[PDB]
Write an enzyme that holds these catalytic residues in place. Structure first.
Site, short mmCIF file in Angstrom:
data_model
loop_
_atom_site.label_atom_id
_atom_site.label_comp_id
_atom_site.label_asym_id
_atom_site.label_seq_id
_atom_site.Cartn_x
_atom_site.Cartn_y
_atom_site.Cartn_z
N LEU A 15 0.81 -1.21 0.00
CA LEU A 15 0.00 0.00 0.00
C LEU A 15 0.84 1.26 0.00
O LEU A 15 0.39 2.31 -0.49
CB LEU A 15 -0.94 0.00 1.21
CG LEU A 15 -1.79 -1.27 1.32
CD1 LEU A 15 -2.55 -1.31 2.63
CD2 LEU A 15 -2.73 -1.39 0.13
N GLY A 16 2.06 1.18 0.51
CA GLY A 16 2.94 2.33 0.59
C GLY A 16 3.74 2.25 1.87
O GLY A 16 3.62 1.31 2.65
N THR A 17 4.56 3.28 2.08
CA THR A 17 5.39 3.40 3.27
C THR A 17 4.92 4.59 4.09
O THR A 17 4.67 5.67 3.53
CB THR A 17 6.87 3.53 2.89
OG1 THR A 17 7.02 4.53 1.88
CG2 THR A 17 7.40 2.21 2.37
N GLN A 19 4.90 6.53 8.36
CA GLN A 19 5.82 7.04 9.36
C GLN A 19 6.57 5.94 10.10
O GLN A 19 7.66 6.19 10.63
CB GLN A 19 5.07 7.91 10.38
N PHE A 20 6.02 4.72 10.13
CA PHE A 20 6.62 3.63 10.89
C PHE A 20 7.20 2.53 10.03
O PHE A 20 7.96 1.70 10.54
CB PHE A 20 5.58 3.04 11.86
CG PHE A 20 4.89 4.07 12.72
CD1 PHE A 20 3.79 4.77 12.24
CD2 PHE A 20 5.34 4.35 14.00
CE1 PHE A 20 3.15 5.73 13.03
CE2 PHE A 20 4.71 5.30 14.79
CZ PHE A 20 3.61 6.00 14.30
N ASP A 128 -0.72 12.51 18.32
CA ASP A 128 -0.31 12.94 16.99
C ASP A 128 -1.50 12.94 16.04
O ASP A 128 -1.45 12.41 14.93
CB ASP A 128 0.82 12.06 16.46
CG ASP A 128 1.50 12.65 15.23
OD1 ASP A 128 1.28 13.85 14.93
OD2 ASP A 128 2.25 11.91 14.56
#
Ligand SMILES: CCC(=O)N1CCC[C@@H](Oc2nc(-c3cnn(C)c3)cn3nccc23)CC1
Length: 256
Positions: A15-17, A19-20, A128
């Site tokens: 799906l993508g990259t 923050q973690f 956050d």
């Protein structure tokens, strides 16, 4: 009870990259859609996270992205969650093809406010909250994601932070309230970056001089009053999420 067997996971699409780490779509036991968060090695306080994951799995709300479990008997560890078919809210808002009505934007705010009122009742801070950390399912419902996860990251959200956070690192329910107001602004600006002409450093300096985010033209006067109430200088003068929800419901009725 918190542990998923990785052998029950089938990885299907990247799906993508985030923050973690990388995030993938897959199936649990060949049947149920899940999102698999692959936590890059060395990036997370993993012992601390496992113990908090047990707490996070008891948090059940229709507008919270559900934690299904974790895989920790290997590396890199996995976080398995509810799959949200339309991706993150930040990117969704930026797709101008949707041609959102404002009632839809207000419903997005209400969805997040309900999840945040739930976390408030459980004395759980998000820490956050932002549109990058909200997700959208196949029915267009917005849910709050990755609540509390920043506590275990081993790039700070200046533009979502009240003055007492920028000045003193004072976190409370009211720094979530402030961040929620910025999130309302992200929604009604169709995903612009808050303080889009400033750096983080200039934002902090201007926030200290009393500057506030302007009214997005799509927000009505009553909607801007709601997001603006989240940004009172004194944290004790900011509403609760229970109050914001009542205010959002009031405007929804008036603009229906
Ligand atoms: C705003 C942040 C951001 O863009 N990313 C990158 C991508 C991964 C994203 O996480 C998920 N992304 C999708 C998705 C992505 N694209 N489509 C069609 C669905 C679904 N689910 N379901 C649970 C989690 C996720 C978070 C981080």
């Amino acid at each position: 009870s918190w542990e998923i067997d990785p052998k029950d996971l089938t990885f299907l699409k990247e799906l993508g990259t985030g923050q973690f780490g990388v995030v993938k779509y897959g199936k649990w036991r060949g049947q149920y859609d899940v999102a698999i968060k692959m936590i890059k090695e060395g990036s997370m306080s993993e012992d601390e996270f496992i113990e908090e994951a047990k707490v996070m799995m008891n948090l059940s709300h229709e507008k919270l992205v559900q934690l299904y479990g974790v895989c920790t008997k290997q590396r890199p560890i996995f976080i398995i969650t509810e799959y949200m078919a339309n991706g993150c809210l930040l990117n969704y808002l930026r797709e101008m093809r949707h041609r959102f009505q404002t009632q839809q934007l207000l419903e997005m705010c209400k969805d997040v406010c309900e999840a945040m009122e739930y976390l408030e009742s459980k004395q759980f801070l998000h820490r956050d909250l932002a549109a990058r950390n909200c997700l959208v399912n196949d029915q267009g419902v917005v849910k709050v994601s990755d609540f509390g996860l920043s506590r275990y990251v081993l790039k700070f959200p200046v533009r979502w932070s009240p003055p007492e956070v920028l000045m003193y690192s004072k976190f409370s329910s009211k720094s979530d309230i402030w961040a929620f107001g910025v999130l309302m602004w992200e929604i009604y600006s169709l995903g612009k970056m808050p303080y889009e002409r400033f750096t983080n450093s200039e934002t902090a300096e201007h926030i200290a001089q009393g500057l506030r985010l302007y009214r997005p033209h799509l927000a009505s006067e009553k909607v801007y009053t709601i997001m603006y109430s989240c940004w009172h200088e004194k944290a004790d003068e900011r509403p609760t999420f229970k109050i914001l929800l009542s205010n959002i419901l009031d405007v929804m009725d008036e603009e229906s």
